[PDB]
Amino acid sequence: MSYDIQAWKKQCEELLNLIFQCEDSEPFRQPVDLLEYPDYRDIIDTPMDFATVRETLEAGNYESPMELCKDVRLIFSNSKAYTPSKRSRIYSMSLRLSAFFEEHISSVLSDYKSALRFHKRNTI
């Protein structure tokens, strides 16, 4: 629907589904095992992963798609910070998936911004 403040929830649910099914998401699907990799929290302040993102959205615990976007971007910035070189195949995966996410999220954010101005201002 045009001017739908709820539309982002379905749009982001679909986008996450397409990310989970993409081979490039494999390293990012689940929280890093902090017991297997006990230096991970030495480097990364705030772990994030696509399963946490998907559960947060399904729970209704994101206020806006900007919040979900900030979490997804944290996945990719965490991977950049943790991986040791741009030669890492894991970093390479994070670049391909990042570029895919950013291509699709822009219209979700734009559509949400317009919907919210309508929600706040309309005299229907």
Residue nearer to Ca ion on the CB measure, 90 or 116: 90
Distance from C-alpha of 19 to C-alpha of 28, rounded to nearest angstrom: 10
Question: Min. distance of Cβ 46 from Ca ion in angstroms?
Answer: 16
Selected range binding Ca ion among 33-41, 64-72, 79-87, 96-104, rule: CB under 5 A? 79-87
Residue nearest to Ca ion (CB): 83
Question: Min. distance of Cβ 99 from Ca ion in angstroms?
Answer: 18
Tokens of 53: 């993102």
Whose CA is closest to 32, among 67, 69, 68, 81? 81
Whether the Cβ atoms of residue 50 and residue 71 lie closer than 8 Å to each other: no
Question: Where does this chain bind Ca ion (CB under 5 A)?
Answer: 83
